[PDB]
């Protein structure tokens, strides 16, 4: 808990759980207010959106090849 | 209600009322989740923030050369 640092900021109204991808160092999490879910790399370089139109996101799990979400 | 339009958007979570000074055709407004009021031109081209570190505005009024902010 000591070297606090924000990675990714702006448009996250209505946030949702975030998952890691440690194979891949990849962060993925879902945006309910534009109803998207959208990775990025674990130093905060990289953001773009994956899934549009989704209605209300709340689970999300990266497995092997495939993002799962509910 | 004919030809909407989209002057400035943002890091608007907590928006509060709008306000317009005619003299100066200029918008003001308050953002609660940042503790700030700003302005901008009705054209949506310039903003910029005119107060800082407020705690919940609620109200705000341009007349004269003043404004007033409850
Ligand atoms: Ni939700
Ligand atoms: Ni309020």
């Given at each position: 808990g000591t070297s606090l640092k924000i990675l990714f900021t702006g448009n996250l109204q209505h946030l949702e759980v975030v998952t890691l991808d440690i194979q891949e160092q990849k962060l993925y999490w879902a945006v309910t207010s534009r109803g998207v879910i959208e990775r990025g790399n674990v130093d905060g370089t990289e953001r773009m959106i994956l899934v549009?139109?989704?209605?209300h996101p709340w689970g999300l799990v990266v497995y092997g090849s495939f993002l799962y979400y509910s």
């Open positions: 549009h139109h989704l209605a």
